[PDB]
Design a binder for this molecule. Structure first.
Ligand SMILES: CN(C[C@H](O)CO)C(=O)c1nn(C)cc1NC(=O)c1nc(C2CC2)ccc1Nc1cncnc1
Ligand SMILES: [Mg+2]
Ligand SMILES: [Zn+2]
Length: 313
């Protein structure tokens, strides 16, 4: 109750900002998350003994992969923290509880392979779950860890509030399947443009939480250039290994995953910023004006990739 978390002065200040990097000290990330839960949620939201045991079991069940790792889990939770603190009054106590947890768990037990590589490999998870394969697996892993003893961080919720929050978490995790983002954004865009968007319509809230989840998931493209550039290497290390594994199956991968096609990466980031990132953060800023800084940072990084092509770096 009276045990607050504090950070150093630089972190205490820079953590409120969207472009905050959680830094290379693994053992500080758990406190960074508790700090964000206590301020976003309150110091009463979670039994600290249970939250801390929950946080360490989630850490335990991320894998040592170049990108979809424990650092990603906390990075995506920090972006969701920033959005919640910039839209203080728009969200319920349960949504703020749920979403930060949704973020920390969204990629549990990720192996570094897309849903497509699971399908072509004929992985058992693709037989159990035909669409959003990894994402249904991530939500499965989250429920499992919540059911471990001393780990039920929601224990003080009523049967119905418990089922609301798991529903919020289930939909939030499923939304991180990018293949679902395109439609979700196009429907948010139209609803905004025809003035029919309504945050009292639960179906509408669901969609808007959807877009937040994509925005937090992609938030490595909203960092300062040196962080974005260095994280791009981690994401491509996974893509190249998946492409290698595609060749192992007898399938020539798309270029973005062909490690023999590095020369095409700057031009591929252009497409990616144009087709995915800028639209995502444009529609978010339209629905949530205080998230403008993510669009700005995303635009700066696009501008930086054009400079790479022009051989100015
Ligand atoms: C074009 N589509 C989407 C397809 O239509 C469907 O998958 C792409 O996914 C795509 N195409 N290219 C050439 C790159 C792509 N993705 C990425 O670079 C990329 N992806 C993801 C998640 C959603 C997978 C997170 C970050 C990404 N980059 C990045 C840049 N800097 C720092 N950190 C990360
Ligand atoms: Mg994912
Ligand atoms: Zn993710």
């Amino acid at each position: 109750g009276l045990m607050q978390f504090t950070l150093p002065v630089r972190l205490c200040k820079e953590i409120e900002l969207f472009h905050f990097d959680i830094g290379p000290f693994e053992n500080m990330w758990p406190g960074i998350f508790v700090y964000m839960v206590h301020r976003s949620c309150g110091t009463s939201c979670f039994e600290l003994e249970k939250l801390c045991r929950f946080i360490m079991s989630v850490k335990k069940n991320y894998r040592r992969v170049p990108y979809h790792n424990w650092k990603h889990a906390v990075t995506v939770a920090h972006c969701m923290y920033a959005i919640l603190q910039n839209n203080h009054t728009l969200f319920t106590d349960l949504e703020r509880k749920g979403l930060l947890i949704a973020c920390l768990c969204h990629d549990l037990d990720h192996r570094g392979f897309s849903n497509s590589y699971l399908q072509k490999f004929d992985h058992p998870l693709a037989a159990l779950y035909s669409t959003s394969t990894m994402e249904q697996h991530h939500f499965s892993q989250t429920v499992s860890i919540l059911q471990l003893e001393g780990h039920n961080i929601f224990s003080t919720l009523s049967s119905s509030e418990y089922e609301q929050v798991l529903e919020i978490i289930r939909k939030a995790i499923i939304a991180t399947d990018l293949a679902l983002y395109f439609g979700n954004r196009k429907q948010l865009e139209e609803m905004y443009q025809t003035g029919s968007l309504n945050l009292n319509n639960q179906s509408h809230r669901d969609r808007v939480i959807g877009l937040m989840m994509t925005a937090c998931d992609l938030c490595s493209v909203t960092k300062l250039w040196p962080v974005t550039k260095l994280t791009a290497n981690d994401i491509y290390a996974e893509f190249w290994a998946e492409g290698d594994e595609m060749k192992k199956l007898g399938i020539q991968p798309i270029p973005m995953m062909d490690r023999d096609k590095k020369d095409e990466v700057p031009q591929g980031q252009l497409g990616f910023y144009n087709a995915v990132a800028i639209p995502c953060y444009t529609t978010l800023t339209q629905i949530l004006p205080p998230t403008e800084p993510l669009l700005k940072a995303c635009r700066d990084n696009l501008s930086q990739w054009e400079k790479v092509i022009r051989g100015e770096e």
